[PDB]
Amino acid sequence: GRLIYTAGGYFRQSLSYLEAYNPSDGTWLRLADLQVPRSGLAGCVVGGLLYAVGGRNNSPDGNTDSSALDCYNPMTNQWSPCAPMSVPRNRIGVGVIDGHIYAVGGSHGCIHHNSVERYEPERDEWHLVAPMLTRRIGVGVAVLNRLLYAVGGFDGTNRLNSAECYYPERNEWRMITAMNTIRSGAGVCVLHNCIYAAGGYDGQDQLNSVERYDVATATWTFVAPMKHRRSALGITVHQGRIYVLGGYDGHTFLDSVECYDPDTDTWSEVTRMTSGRSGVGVAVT
Ligand SMILES: CC(=O)N1CCC[C@H]1C(=O)N[C@@H]1COC(=O)c2cccc(-c3cccc(C(=O)O)c3)c2CSC[C@H](C(=O)N(C)C)NC1=O
Ligand SMILES: [Cl-]
């Protein structure tokens, strides 16, 4: 029994919701709220524990970028603060290699990070690794073949279609084949040995197109687009299918949850979140 967890998000302000969807029965569980509301965060799982990394708390009073790492234990329904990152990272990308969390790019006020840092749960420590070749906020991150890919985003001047790859044993980055579409705020994940980039913002419009990167051929190929255009969507893989949760379509904050079946190349609306929101952190455990 694995659930799709959605943490935080944004609807008029940053949210503290932690909710879990069971794809087997269509139920949503209302779990313990985050101690501090956040949007632009990312979720991940290490050893059955859920992590909420970075983001920003936007309130009608003022906004605060987060360098926080918080840990949720599904067995206790309790959040526990962990060591914070070296810098606040809003609109962050996260990836897990060998039970180590990589926090990629993101923004802190006027700053757009190229810096990347790694968290070791067993030591409760963060350490900087080699920075990316490009500054990237709203960056999609995927782990494939024990390599950490940074896909698209925004370098502070332009939205990007470029993508790069990190070699943890060598501690270095290399640019890979760029996507067909410029995407900032896309949902990036790996399914069946392919990296998928769904939705995002091309600098003018929110996207519904979805493309996948094949490593053997080094080519990005378009697959069936989602029914709803969305940027700042949450994304995860569950039982061989991609799930996209919420997002922003340019006017409204989506509650729509779509599911991609790779065997039939089709998307379908599987459920709706309890309320519309963008900038959620998603993970499965
Ligand atoms: C103008 C603006 O962005 N805002 C002013 C008040 C605070 C802030 C505000 O509304 N943010 C909330 C939160 O959104 C995310 O968490 C979030 C999380 C991850 C990625 C992205 C993302 C997507 C596309 C491109 C880029 C890129 O970096 O180029 C980044 C976002 C921003 S989605 C845009 C939408 C918006 O602009 N309006 C006006 C509601 N913003 C949001 O949903
Ligand atoms: Cl924001």
Numbering used by the authors: 325 to 609
Task: Paste lines from the article.
The nuclear factor erythroid 2-related factor 2 (Nrf2) upregulates the cellular defense system against oxidative stress by mediating the transcription of enzymes acting as antioxidants or being involved in detoxification.
The m- and p-benzoic acids 63 and 64 were included in the set to target R483 and R415 via salt bridges, and m-benzoic acid 63 had a potency comparable to compound 1. The Keap1-bound structures of compounds 60, 63, and 64 were determined by X-ray crystallography at 2.2, 2.3, and 2.4 Å resolution, respectively. The meta carboxylic acid group of compound 63 forms a salt bridge with the side chain of R483, just as the para carboxylic acid of 64 which also forms a hydrogen bond with S508. Both oxygen atoms of the carboxylate group of compound 64 interact with the guanidine side chain of R483 via a bidentate and coplanar interaction. In contrast, only one oxygen atom of the carboxyl group of 63 interacts with R483 in a less preferred “back-side” geometry. The orientation of R483 is almost identical in the complexes with compounds 1 and 63, whereas it has undergone a significant adjustment in the complex with 64. Interestingly, this water molecule has been displaced by the substituents at the ortho-position of the macrocyclic phenylene moiety of compounds 60, 63, and 64.
